[PDB]
Amino acid sequence: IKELAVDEELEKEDGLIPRQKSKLCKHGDRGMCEYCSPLPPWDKEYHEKNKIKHISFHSYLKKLNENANKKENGSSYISPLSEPDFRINKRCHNGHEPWPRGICSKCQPSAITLQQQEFRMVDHVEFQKSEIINEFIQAWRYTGMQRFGYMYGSYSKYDNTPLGIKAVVEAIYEPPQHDEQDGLTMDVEQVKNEMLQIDRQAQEMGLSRIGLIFTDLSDAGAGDGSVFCKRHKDSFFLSSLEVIMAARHQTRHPNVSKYSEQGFFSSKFVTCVISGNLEGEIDISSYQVSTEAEALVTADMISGSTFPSMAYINDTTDERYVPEIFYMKSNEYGITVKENAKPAFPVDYLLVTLTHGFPNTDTETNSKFVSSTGFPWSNRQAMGQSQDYQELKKYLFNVASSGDFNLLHEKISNFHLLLYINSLQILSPDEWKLLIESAVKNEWEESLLKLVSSAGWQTLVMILQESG
Template sequence: MILRFRTKDGTFRVNVDSGDDFASALHSLGDQIGAQLANVTISTTPTGNKEEATSLVGRKISQLGLKHGDMLFANYDRADQNEEQTVEQELVKANEHVGTTAEQVYHNIKQLPVDDLLDKKDGKIYRKRDPKMCKHGEKGMCEYCMPLEPFDKGYQEEHSIKHLSFHAYLRELDTNTNKTESQSSFMAPLSEPDYTVAKSCPSGHPPWPEGICSKCQPSAITLQQQPFRMVDHVEFANPSIINSFIDAWRVSGMQRIGYLYGRYEPYDLVPLGIKAVVEAVYEPPQQDEADGVTLVLPWENEHLVDRVAGMCGLTKVGVIYTDLMDAGKGDGSVVCKRHVDSYFLSSLEIAFSAKLQKDHPTPSRWSTSGKFSSKFVTCVISGNQKGEIDISSYQVSTSAEGMVTADLIEPSVNPAVMRVKEPTPARYVPDVFYRKLNEYKLAVQENAKPAFPVEYLLVTLTHGFPDEARPLFSSPKHFAIENRGHLGTSQDFQELSKQLGLKNNQSGEDTSLDAISDFHMLVYIISLGILSHEEEKLLVRVAMSHEVQHGLELVESSGWQTLLTIIREST
């Protein structure tokens, strides 16, 4: 008989006999997942009462009342991991033991490919000969046409650059920290802000809260606009990615949240710039409401979705959500809620973004800790001042990350301000200030307690679409998006049959390769647990390359034929 197990890694089928001990089913499940399982709980429904697997071990399958084809829901921890990983997960694992000195970190840390690429570029801003100012010939050079450094102040002012790219900022810091004429050892130019009390103080007094001194207490915090940004631009590979996401609001009037899956690439419009290229939006299980969403972290199937993305060469690059309200004019216009006189990102959203950025750190050989801030972006779809649906892209500053980590700030009922928490015996709160222009246009320093404007924690990015769309997933038909059952669409064999064109082509041999090129469908098929690991890789290869030879291999594989048989019998 066959028992089916629905897990965070997908659905798996286990062959057992009715007289077998339930332990044999668990061993078979672990073998299929490719990992040792720990803390296993079993239930017969997704939200039903969970029983410890240890209480079921020693009992026969028949004694548990299980029949052929029954579906069980299993939760567990992984005692080991032997699966496809996203680029981010691979880097975290590779950077666990890199040493403690600046030189050890520099030589051993494994960075993102885009950072390694930009580290090798000179980043100079090359200029043409100025016919008015240059007095030399075509092959000469003077101060008016010589290349500029990527962090040149004059260039920033001339082009109204609000934030330097991360690598331009890094070059400026490194130039000042590690001077070429100096023979001293390498010093890491970057360090993450730490607003907590040092745990081990050389003064010898009892640790906080019993004792504190000037050596272990954090310095006062002065908030100001961050001069750089980790990502400069967010590029959506295809406008249909956004349209499909907004459709949920158009149908229900409820807000929606999704995770952006893509990759990081150099951005040529900014000196040493970086862009996040978004190839797909995955919508996790959520409770939609008219004024927001309720999301449980970590969400169901997150590990599986990350694994499929890793097979496609993608990783989580950000989060996107809607904040839309129909204007009631009947012309499709929406209310503009976010503007200069209200807020662009609320204090609650900034705290949320800071948490996500801390969960997705950027490894960096230039940092004392081996990591620095994050390239994780936040995109908001809301109404602009013209009443049009528009996208805004943001990150929060390293100060925001540090203050959230140290538990110094909390959201306010006023979305435009962030509250500074009160000190407690367990929480030391340093002095917090921010600079602003007074009524005489002079820069003055203000006390940030009890609250301060949220814009001091905000970093703005640009966004757009490519001139010529070449998305990674190019299916002309869109497979049903996950977790939209309340909207009348669901991922099932009926939808899969429709996507693959099996109603008119029962054999499935002439299925278009383009039809398979859909991220949502890839995740669904792999979650069924029908294909072997090698067949999963082949499926992803077909979806991305569209090569006929790989398509023929997939169609002839036993797992694919089994899938087609199940689809035909279920529809």
């Protein structure tokens, strides 16, 4: 099987950390005893020294390869990187062949200790431009209600975190949803039918749906104060209703891995939320879900509770056997061992954090999508920017009826403009594929003149001039 091009590059590099000679070393200069030996990239002591709170899963893959492959014979190639299962094997390899009549300890799911995950799949989410997500908050500034979107992007290496993958996003697509002041809830059938055609155009453009965003602002008084502070240390970090939508999105998009026995493991999916800081701004934060316990129990046992920090655990009806969930908390006198014989266990423990950021404006490798970021989006029907062909006379117009190719190609690289053109499918699919590849790639000057000489682009500007 074949993995991603980014995932195979992190596997080949060892990522060792070099050290220097010290006063504690008693050996010679041409050697190393223990104090200047090469440090492994999975040691968590070096991680918390530089305030890195997770061990960068590609290095966690290396720390399990040392346990799988040894100096001894072995002759196995097991590679035990699989999803730990809480479901019940029906055959059970014993005399209690039905679960209605019989269950023993080798098939019973053990009591969940609630230990936090030490490794994250995505180590650092990054963005492309501050003007891209400024249009997303501007949707709230016009209708006053919450929004929703899906992030399309790619992946590359990250040199800050040892053996880490960074998440790059390029554009944000919004599905048609019904907004509300308190929260939001849309139909999953019309979104999945709409997201199927966007994945078609994302393949030729080199994009993949790897993220989503949802807003939560609660403006205070619209004067000096920006927003309220809903999510803090004493309150919930992520609501339990949005854990369900984050869990189903990770199971729909698996990550291919040759080390896993099933063929897919350790999904690379980000969930970002606009919530605001403690003091005064609308700074965002992102956390992703845990694979070890939460990713498998969401198929059978997650039920909604009235508290945003916790989630209710329901009962067993003849196939849905669940084990007891335990966690430690302080009582009125001291700190005690596991107490939970009670439902509504918290879900903030099962989240691992990420580091969001925006790159510097002075230099970058590329940006690939900065045309205007002011074009009316596809499914923004709550706002007034959902126009017909009247907008195409205002937006591009083949500027001033005779456009220069340095000023014409800079507008054609928009994500939602190219996704609006092919829906009319005036051009051929072969000429459309070279149209979107010219706008997204470099050395575009020889191929842009091929587009203007084609009869399909001439019919597009002729059918636009007669219409309003």
